[PDB]
Design a protein around this ligand. Structure first.
Ligand SMILES: Nc1ncnc2c1ncn2[C@H]1C[C@H](O)[C@@H](COP(=O)(O)OP(=O)(O)OP(=O)(O)O)O1
Ligand SMILES: Nc1ncnc2c1ncn2[C@H]1C[C@H](O)[C@@H](COP(=O)(O)OP(=O)(O)OP(=O)(O)O)O1
Ligand SMILES: Nc1ncnc2c1ncn2[C@H]1C[C@H](O)[C@@H](COP(=O)(O)OP(=O)(O)OP(=O)(O)O)O1
Ligand SMILES: Nc1ncnc2c1ncn2[C@H]1C[C@H](O)[C@@H](COP(=O)(O)OP(=O)(O)OP(=O)(O)O)O1
Ligand SMILES: Nc1ccn([C@@H]2O[C@H](COP(=O)(O)OP(=O)(O)O)[C@@H](O)[C@H]2O)c(=O)n1
Ligand SMILES: Nc1ccn([C@@H]2O[C@H](COP(=O)(O)OP(=O)(O)O)[C@@H](O)[C@H]2O)c(=O)n1
Ligand SMILES: [Mg+2]
Ligand SMILES: [Mg+2]
Ligand SMILES: [Mg+2]
Ligand SMILES: [Mg+2]
Lengths: 745, 745
């Protein structure tokens, strides 16, 4: 008949338009009514309406229209967040316990199987404790997310039932706290309130599988080859298949595979090298997706540069060429020793050999690698001799073209790690921050936890240090409770992760801490500031693991580590820390009790986590002050809201200032309406000299017991800033030369 | 600030959308609610709304959107009429008297002059009689117009004040009845109620200037040249300028101007002919517009075919050629005698002469013209001799290309008219229906009144005859009261229009009378029907003028007319009328009292009048069953609503039948969903053989004392149907061969 809409109860009515403005103005309380205008939003919604429309599409399109209108006044972000979050909170259930009973009592709607979303012990903990725990949840905190962080949180992370999302966000975060803190409830309420107050957040597989039926909370996996045979290659392929099933990240050390042309004693033939093998890993990276297709399964391939197939390895992730000689859905990385640095330095030659001819090489680092490599370089057992600057030119061609390979430094990582007593660290994970020991028997597993920073900044614009160590103590107790609950997908993972027991802590949003502390990025108080911050994080981490080892005893391989010898991570950098803390009593209690976890700190990139909480990616500056937004039918420009927060107060903001920053791509310094302080507080990273950031990485990574991601931003391809940049990173002592060479077009 | 609309009081408010659907559903009472849908109309209105919009634009766009949605169901025409008419009736004043005081008390808003819209005697009649007359008006009748008839009535006919229309339609029709019936009120209330019940309507200059300050109620003007000198040409140009100022229609007899090359005794030169002279009349037709630019001033130019400049006259209204040899904003017509018919008939020759050489020719018709033309054809005084079929081929080239010239028959008009005693009828008006005597002293003026037809059809589908003569009596009393109130623009007009005193009555919408009487157009009861109708109209007209002559005496030149000799118009056609009436007592009372008006009946085209009342153009069939509508941003297709009225009852109407009639251009007979009666009741005029219509014109024009318009519709250029058509019209005896040759593309 007429234009009827399908009202959410399931019924239909006539189109009465004042229900829209009746609802929006109800959801506009507490905003600037001088620019909050329900009529424009209603008008663009009615531009899209038709007959027979479910009303949840009208609320979705209402929040979408408010998100597109956010450019006119910044309160429409708060409005659009209230529209989407109110749309969800009207939909699903109020009580957490009946949601959990609905998830456990799930039935596959065409197979009849009692196929739960949560394990029965999780439901046991909930139903035994629902009275305190339903009282602990606070739904006032769900209106605190950004809109785009809420849509990113909704599209993939909330547990769905037949396509309809059936979890509020506090149901997910309380589900995580039950999923980790099993027996105890006080830790679940301190962990819940410290969690939902957005102080720290766990990693994404923890948000996937906390308390579910297959609890695989880990996110870091480091695998090396079992053998240089078909059985080793395909058994390693099997382990990468299972681990990439249970939503992990896999970095593979592929150093020990014989090269093209070496003799095969079994079938009297010659090998074809690494290129079809890594092509098999290419199709495996396409087939298995992490979890329920939530993100594609990605593999890192690490190769040391002395291997003979290095040129076809570097020409492998490209765009042109034959298709059968490209494997472009992987991530390639070079695990470079100091000798290739020295031979590129003085234009000498370089010996590409085959690890069947020269066996047992990648397990040897430093001066011993110099002696063994020189002794094989003497005997003439090598196969090819290439001038080192030619291969360096090939590396800069590959990084210039695609950004791959990554570059890590072998002797720097093997020298400055707490797992020296085990052997030689072969590889690292996909995002190049977990530097741990791998073997044929031990497959390295590490857990993650990302602390935010800008929630700690007080109103005095003086940073809070004493809170940060305290939350770090709660985090270390969380991860150390994670390691003993996790279900490892392969049997080699449990022995490594329970013998050595590592954790991982990484912060996100350093640029917001600098803006809210009101310092320039290349100032003196910034370089003092991050140094003091990671002294606080590192100190509180060591105090927390000390207080755990006082209660459960240290890990199984402690005596032999340099921490048992008193050398902490900063002395391996030979940098005495500041007088901000008391390190003597810390080293006394460590010398009397040990520590519980081997490796502690690890700055991860946190793309998706910082996408949720609105912070910037972990430590880098803003890419531009204008950042785009992916909206259906609108992909548009939103300025940095801290910059806009200062501009509305300083008066220089007007109705075309956005258009004034369109034609400069974030560069606010070219405009004549300038207080000449925003040019220091809001430096575009393209307008930031990279070597100051590298010095800041030398200080901060000098207070980190693992590596850290390092997105290199360079506007134009030039070999001097690249070559001097990598050599400068090697001279400062960094464990990671690069993670991406990013060139803006 | 926000989106505020300017509410009609002059204020502003927020955009609240349920005021729209709150109003439309209030204006939807009495319609089919199964398809009446306010939400679609509201949706397309809100597609056009913006901030700072006057609400009368929202009602205008609402009625416009309903007019475009009328295709889905025919009740949206009734809706859109109620929207526009309610928009006007909310706007202007309720009382007629204060509107008249506002119009008389008008002041030019930048000259201060008391420049009235009505004369002071009109306001005297209103203010002396406002108590009965404000009670007589019925505003229930304004919701009876069509939408497009109301917009056509509003854009040009209602008297505006500074661009804002300040007259309701009943204010205009009551203003007309006061403007004609001055002293009497009973005639103003019978005339008002018979008028506003849409029975008959006056002509368009009557609607322009009834009771205004310059009352020029006439619409027919026939002028001939005073002299074949510069003084005669430019004095005639002066009279055409003044008459075209006061909104008349001018037909000019340009027979008596000497041709190209004749000697000029004053300045010893030779004339250039007619072409630059008619070019001067071209620019005069562009400059002076009728009234307040309400329609462009148009001139008819009549020429008899024996004049020497006839070839450049026929090649004059074209599209190509040099610009200085074209006069295309005129209307050209040939005033053909029988001799050109006979010489084209038998392929003989034809004598093109010059009226300076052969003087006193156009004042002579018939056999006397044959004798005088043969005597000048004998003496060799002629100048050119052209084969007659060549000039006939030139005429068919001109009518084929543009439709001009018109064709009238000289001896047929001079033989069958009541003004034989005066002399020779030279010319006729622009629309070729007023055939009256012109002279140097008498400039012919005729008034018009168009009766509708389909209001007379009773529910029994038997036509009402006794009402039609009665309304015809009221009409004849109206026009005879018009002639004595009118203000003639030139002094020669008053002597003609008061000596001979003619009137004019023409009907509109014959196709609707045939459909509502349910007969085929080419049936037997149609040809019986229009014959009976014009016997009724002609009989009631003669009875009315008889009853006027019983009270005031006949006109000044009665004794000498053939009506005084007893011969009425039908005996000049030698057709005895039917036994429907009593003609003997009529001819007795005429023989004892005479008649008051010389010429009575005149079928005019009525483009604009039938555009108001929704009827078809006067006597022709429908051009197509689908007719387009001019709407801003929508120029679309609406079917004939009587056809649609039968299709919704007979069930064959469905939701794509319009699309089934798109690809046939009104031809409903090609579709397979056919009751084979609609193919007879709804014949497209392109699917109608023209000679049956010509026979119907012989009967109906055999009962008309003047000529009648005749739009000839022929789909393709073919010389046989044209030539046989004009010869057939001459053989039936018609006074008008053609008014347009229309070819659909
Ligand atoms: N009758 C209607 N016609 C068109 N849109 C409507 C109508 N009613 C509500 N809407 C719009 C307004 C909102 O933008 C959106 C959601 O309305 P909403 O009221 O929340 O559904 P609902 O009526 O079931 O919720 P609730 O019953 O709790 O009020 O749909
Ligand atoms: N048929 C083959 N095609 C391509 N590559 C092969 C083939 N067989 C073996 N390889 C590669 C896989 C390993 O990289 C390598 C050795 O495999 P492996 O089983 O150890 O050889 P083998 O034991 O039979 O001879 P060897 O004793 O020399 O190793 O050669
Ligand atoms: N506040 C509004 N915002 C947008 N459109 C409106 C608003 N109010 C009325 N309209 C629409 C409804 C109608 O289609 C059109 C004209 O409204 P209308 O009510 O007749 O003006 P009005 O309010 O001055 O008349 P009245 O005072 O007699 O009610 O404008
Ligand atoms: N100068 C001119 N240019 C063009 N046409 C002219 C001119 N003078 C006269 N005519 C035309 C207009 C008339 O159609 C025609 C006669 O005009 P008119 O005044 O009667 O001439 P006339 O009286 O001086 O000489 P005649 O006695 O021959 O008419 O000649
Ligand atoms: N595309 C990616 C990126 C990272 N990761 C893994 O997630 C870890 C940290 O990356 P991250 O914190 O940016 O991942 P998110 O938590 O943001 O999803 C890495 O060590 C990888 O193991 C992944 O599996 N797939
Ligand atoms: N374009 C026109 C059409 C007609 N007319 C005059 O109006 C008379 C009848 O034409 P009509 O009845 O179609 O004119 P309307 O009343 O429809 O405007 C003609 O005799 C002309 O004198 C005109 O002046 N201009
Ligand atoms: Mg509701
Ligand atoms: Mg082997
Ligand atoms: Mg109103
Ligand atoms: Mg003269």
């Amino acid at each position: 008949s007429h234009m009827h809409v399908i009202k959410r109860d399931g019924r239909q009515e006539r189109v009465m338009f004042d229900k829209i403005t009746s609802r929006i103005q109800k959801l506009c309380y507490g905003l600037n009514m001088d620019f909050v205008d329900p009529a424009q939003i209603t008008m663009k919604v009615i531009q899209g309406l038709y007959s027979g429309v479910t009303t949840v599409e009208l609320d979705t399109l209402a929040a979408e229209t408010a998100a597109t209108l956010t450019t006119k006044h910044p309160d429409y972000a708060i409005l659009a967040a209230r529209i989407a979050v109110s749309n969800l909170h009207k939909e699903t259930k109020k009580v957490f316990s009946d949601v959990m009973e609905d998830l456990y009592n799930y039935i596959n709607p065409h197979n009849g199987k009692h196929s739960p979303m949560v394990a029965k012990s999780t439901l046991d903990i909930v139903l035994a404790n629902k009275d305190r725990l339903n009282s602990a949840i606070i739904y006032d905190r769900d209106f605190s997310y950004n809109y785009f962080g809420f849509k990113t949180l909704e599209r993939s992370y909330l547990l769905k039932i037949n396509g309809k999302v059936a979890e509020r966000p506090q149901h997910m975060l309380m589900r995580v706290s039950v999923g980790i803190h099993k027996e105890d409830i006080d830790a679940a309420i301190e962990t819940y309130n410290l969690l939902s107050e957005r102080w720290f957040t766990h990693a994404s597989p923890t948000l996937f599988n906390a308390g579910t039926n297959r609890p695989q909370l880990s996110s870091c996996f480091l695998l090396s080859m079992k053998d240089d045979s078909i059985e080793g290659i395909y058994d390693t392929l099997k382990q990468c298949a299972l681990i990439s099933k249970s939503a992990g990240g896999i970095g593979v050390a592929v150093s020990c595979i014989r090269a093209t042309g070496s003799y095969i004693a079994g079938t009297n033939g010659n090998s074809n090298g690494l290129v079809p093998m890594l092509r098999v890993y290419n199709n495996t990276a396409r087939y298995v997706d992490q979890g329920g297709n939530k993100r594609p399964g990605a593999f890192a391939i690490y190769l040391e540069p002395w291997h003979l197939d290095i040129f076809e390895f570097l020409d492998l992730k490209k765009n042109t060429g034959k298709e059968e000689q490209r494997a472009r859905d992987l991530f390639f990385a070079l695990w470079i020793p100091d000798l290739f640095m020295k031979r590129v330095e003085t234009n000498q030659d370089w010996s590409l050999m085959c690890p069947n001819e020269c066996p047992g090489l990648d397990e040897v680092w430093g001066e011993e690698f110099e002696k063994l490599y020189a002794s094989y370089e003497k005997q003439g057992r090598v196969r090819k001799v290439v001038k080192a600057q030619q291969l360096w030119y090939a590396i800069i061609e590959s990084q210039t073209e695609t950004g791959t390979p990554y570059m890590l430094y072998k002797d720097s990582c093997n020298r400055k790690s707490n797992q020296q007593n085990l052997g030689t660290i072969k590889c690292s994970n996909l995002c190049t921050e977990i530097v741990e020991y791998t073997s044929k028997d031990e497959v390295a597993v590490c857990n993650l936890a990302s602390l935010a920073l800008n929630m700690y900044v007080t109103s005095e614009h003086t940073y809070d240090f004493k809170k940060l160590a305290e939350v770090t103590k709660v985090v270390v107790r969380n991860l150390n409770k994670i390691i003993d609950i996790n279900y490892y997908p392969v049997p080699e993972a449990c022995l490594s992760n329970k013998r050595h027991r590592p954790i991982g802590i990484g912060v996100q949003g350093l640029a917001d801490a600098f803006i809210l502390m009101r310092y320039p990025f290349e100032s003196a108080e910034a370089q003092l500031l991050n140094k003091q911050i990671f002294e606080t994080i590192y100190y509180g981490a060591l105090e927390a693991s000390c207080d755990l080892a006082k209660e459960q005893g240290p890990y199984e391989t402690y005596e032999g580590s340099p921490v048992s010898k008193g050398i902490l991570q900063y002395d391996m950098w030979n940098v005495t820390p500041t007088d901000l803390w008391d390190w003597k009593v810390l080293k006394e209690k460590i010398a009397k009790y040990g520590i519980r976890n081997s490796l502690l700190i690890a700055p991860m990139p946190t793309a998706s986590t910082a996408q949720i909480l609105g912070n910037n990616e972990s430590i880098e500056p803003y890419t531009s002050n204008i950042y785009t937004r992916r909206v259906l039918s609108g992909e548009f420009q939103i300025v940095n809201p801290h910059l806009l927060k200062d501009l509305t107060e300083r008066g220089l903001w007007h109705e075309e200032m956005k258009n004034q920053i369109i034609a400069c791509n974030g560069s606010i310094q070219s405009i004549p309406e300038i207080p000449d302080d925003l040019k220091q507080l809001y430096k575009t990273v393209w307008e930031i000299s990279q070597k100051t950031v590298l010095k800041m990485a030398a200080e901060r990574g000098a207070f980190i017991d693992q590596s850290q991601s390092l997105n290199i931003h360079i506007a134009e391809p030039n070999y001097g800033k690249l070559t001097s940049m990598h050599f400068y990173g090697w001279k400062q002592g960094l464990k990671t030369g690069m993670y991406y060479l990013r060139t803006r077009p």
